[PDB]
DNA sequence: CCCTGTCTGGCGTCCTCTCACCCCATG
DNA sequence: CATGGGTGCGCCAGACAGGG
């Protein structure tokens, strides 16, 4: 669609696989049942100082090639004419026309 | 006080060596001027007199001592030199060496058809005693079960 | 010998196009070292050149 | 190559490469056991010699 | 109790893959219990293909999944000596669990 | 330092034709 | 089975001590 939504995933795919592709206690577990004192509490003030792009909730998963939001399949990881571009050109194994 | 000596022997007679140089002290009874003789080299707790030195090369089957010179040669580096050599020995035969693989770890196989190959444990199994790693043969990975002991931790 | 004075992969095969064995006897991939055996695949006076 | 009964009439060299190849290994596993300083002493000058 | 299964797409190339690894290790090893399969396995994706409108042109295709399992009776030093990296069947995944 | 004695090395003809025999030794 | 350690040649010549 653009190069500048493109431009948003190169962005999108660093900073949250600096913290939120690993480090997952400090985002998920550090609330569990505890006590309600303020510290864990404190914990997600922490989660505030880091950017809220950089979450695995930002995760849109976009054509590698021309970046189209809607119509996606994971399987692949394309937009919903290249797994035809590959049908048709036969850029992928096994991918047959269904002639059931 | 009696300290330790290195004595050189012909390569493959060292026990009857050993046993030659017991029976030379209890034959020229100096039995006050030798402690031990431990095992192609045999250390011996001595003193240095030229009449021991004599009776030690008078051995059969003994080249000589081995030292800084011929005239006073030499005890040893450390105090139990040879104690050391001989506790290395035993710790080589029991050759104690990192051997295993665990989840997200690479491994190395030095049995079976697999052997000399590298390959990361994908699955562990500590309760079957059994690692779940593959081999890259022919390109594609060879998911095999190796044991601790049949592959090293790499 | 496997790495010995008289090595297979370290200078080559005894037999000309022969690797070591069951691999490769006839004349199409000179060259290929099977886990097998690490030997070389080359004619006969390659190894006293090595 | 071996003679008419077919025990093999070795060459000088290979008992010299032989000899060499021995006290290197020799000398390579007492440098692992830390050998004393008198015992490298002699490798060393065995494998000087050899 | 080994396990030899591979694992691919079409039935008509590992059907010579079922073939190079019961016979090669008949010559070295002769101890197998025979190819026993595994049910065909379908991926069918029904996909949109006009640029920018109309909810009906949705043409099938799948990308479809064989598996063929070898199981060899004993664990043999010789069958896996001589057919360790070697797999006639390319651009194919060999799991030999043993 | 300038001559004198010693100590080790380097070397000694070319072609052939038979023969005989090539590491013990052993716990 | 596999490894592990004589004493009859004579000249030249230069390098190494050895006086000198």
């Given at each position: 669609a653009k190069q500048s939504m493109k431009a948003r995933e190169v962005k999108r795919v660093a900073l949250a696989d600096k913290y939120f592709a690993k480090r997952a206690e400090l985002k998920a577990i550090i609330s569990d049942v505890n006590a309600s004192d303020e510290d864990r509490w404190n914990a997600v003030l922490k989660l505030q100082t880091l950017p809220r792009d950089s979450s695995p909730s930002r995760q849109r998963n976009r054509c590698r090639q021309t970046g189209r939001p809607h119509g996606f399949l994971r399987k692949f990881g394309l937009s919903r004419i290249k797994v035809r571009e590959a049908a048709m050109r036969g850029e992928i194994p096994g991918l047959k026309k269904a002639s059931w | 006080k009696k300290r330790w000596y290195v004595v050189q022997a012909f390569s493959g007679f060292e026990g009857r060596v050993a046993t030659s140089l017991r029976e030379h002290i209890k034959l020229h009874?100096?039995?006050?001027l030798f402690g031990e003789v431990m095992v192609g080299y045999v250390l011996v707790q001595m003193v240095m007199n030229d009449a021991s030195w004599h009776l030690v090369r008078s051995v059969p089957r003994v080249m000589g001592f081995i030292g800084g010179t011929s005239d006073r040669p030499a005890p040893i580096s450390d105090k139990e030199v040879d104690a050391i050599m001989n506790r290395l020995q035993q710790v080589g035969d029991k050759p104690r060496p990192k051997t295993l693989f665990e989840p997200g770890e690479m491994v190395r196989v030095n049995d079976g058809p697999f052997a000399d190959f590298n390959g990361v444990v994908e699955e562990v199994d500590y309760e079957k005693s059994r690692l779940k790693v593959s081999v890259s043969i022919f390109g594609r990975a060879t998911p095999v079960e190796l044991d601790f002991s049949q592959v090293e931790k790499a | 010998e496997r790495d010995g004075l008289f090595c297979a992969r370290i200078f080559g095969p005894v037999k000309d196009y022969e690797c070591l064995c069951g691999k490769y006897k006839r004349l199409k991939h000179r060259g290929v070292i099977c886990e097998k055996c690490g030997v070389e695949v080359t004619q006969t006076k390659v190894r006293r050149e090595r | 190559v071996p003679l008419d009964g077919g025990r093999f009439a070795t060459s000088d060299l290979n008992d010299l490469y032989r000899r060499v190849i021995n006290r290197n290994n020799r000398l390579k596993r007492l440098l692992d056991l830390a050998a004393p300083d008198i015992i490298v002493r002699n490798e060393k000058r065995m494998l000087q010699e050899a | 109790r080994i396990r030899i299964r591979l694992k691919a797409f079409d039935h008509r190339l590992i059907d010579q893959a079922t073939a190079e690894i019961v016979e090669t290790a008949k010559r070295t090893g002769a101890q197998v219990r025979g190819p026993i399969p595994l049910p065909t396995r379908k991926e069918r994706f029904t996909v949109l293909i006009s640029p920018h409108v109309n909810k009906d042109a949705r043409d099938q295709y799948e990308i479809r999944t064989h598996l063929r399992l070898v199981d060899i009776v004993e664990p043999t030093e010789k069958t896996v000596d001589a057919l360790m990296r070697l797999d006639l069947a390319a651009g194919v995944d060999v799991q030999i669990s043993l």
């Open positions: - | 009874n100096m039995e006050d | - | - | -």
